Amino acid sequence: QRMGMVIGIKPEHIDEYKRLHAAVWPAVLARLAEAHVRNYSIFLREPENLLFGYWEYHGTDYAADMEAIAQDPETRRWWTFCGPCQEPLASRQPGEHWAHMEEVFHVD
Amino acid sequence: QRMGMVIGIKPEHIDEYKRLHAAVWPAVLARLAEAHVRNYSIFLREPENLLFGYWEYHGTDYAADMEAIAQDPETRRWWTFCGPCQEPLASRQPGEHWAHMEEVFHVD
Numbered sequence: 001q002r003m004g005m006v007i008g009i010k011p012e013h014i015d016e017y018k019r020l021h022a023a024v025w026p027a028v029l030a031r032l033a034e035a036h037v038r039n040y041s042i043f044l045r046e047p048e049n050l051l052f053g054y055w056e057y058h059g060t061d062y063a064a065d066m067e068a069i070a071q072d073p074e075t076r077r078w079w080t081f082c083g084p085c086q087e088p089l090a091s092r093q094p095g096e097h098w099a100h101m102e103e104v105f106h107v108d
Numbered sequence: 109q110r111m112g113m114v115i116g117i118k119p120e121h122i123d124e125y126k127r128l129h130a131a132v133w134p135a136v137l138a139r140l141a142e143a144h145v146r147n148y149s150i151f152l153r154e155p156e157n158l159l160f161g162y163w164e165y166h167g168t169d170y171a172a173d174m175e176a177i178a179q180d181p182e183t184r185r186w187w188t189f190c191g192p193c194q195e196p197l198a199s200r201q202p203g204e205h206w207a208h209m210e211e212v213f214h215v216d
């Protein structure tokens with residue numbers, strides 16, 4: 001199961017966001033691996049100031065594993081650093097931070 | 109070597125683009141596999157009307173393998189169908205159709 005997601009970034013915080021992601025906290029990464037998230041990349045587009053996340057989810061209840069992460073206190077502290085850098089899409093659903101995208105094509 | 113890329117889509121052509129990609133021409137996929145492109149997905153975001161492509165490139169000279177594809181006669185015919193659906197970013201470099209993104213994070 002593949003997922004693509006999208007969020008805005010504030011241009012004045014792009015360097016800070018890159019610095020943070022050069023050394024993502026081990027507790028954050030372990031909590032992501034425990035929720036069955038693998039092969040996870042984030043891409044940046046300037047000048048449109050968009051972040052594209054891609055990951056492969058090997059779990060069996062996505063909505064639960066995501067709420068697991070959402071309450072990990074170390075991940076919530078990490079989000080106090082990343083969040084201010086980001087600009088959630090005005091068009092997202094209630095409850096979304098990153099906005100989900102629809103897969104329209106895959107080839108192995 | 110992971111790569112992320114982005115292009116616009118015209119909302120009036122979204123259904124046609126999805127239909128085309130439900131059965132991508134076998135010659136197009138063969139030329140992509142022979143250029144060492146693997147694990148290739150395309151995601152769509154409405155309402156921002158953005159397409160996000162992700163692939164993993166196991167080749168040795170990216171700029172050459174991309175040029176090989178760009179001259180394949182069957183791929184150029186295929187692009188006469190996809191292209192009219194797309195809206196290349198006004199901000200892209202000369203020579204780009206899809207605009208490349210910068211990887212800022214990966215975890216396995």
Ligand SMILES: C[C@@H]1O[C@@H](O)[C@@H](O)[C@H](O)[C@@H]1O
Pocket residue numbers: 024028042082
């Ligand atoms: C490791 C990643 O770091 C930031 O980019 C967050 O927005 C993501 O939710 C994730 O925690």
Ligand SMILES: C[C@@H]1O[C@@H](O)[C@@H](O)[C@H](O)[C@@H]1O
Pocket residue numbers: 132136150190
């Ligand atoms: C298979 C893919 O199909 C369309 O989306 C094109 O824009 C891509 O370049 C690629 O050929």
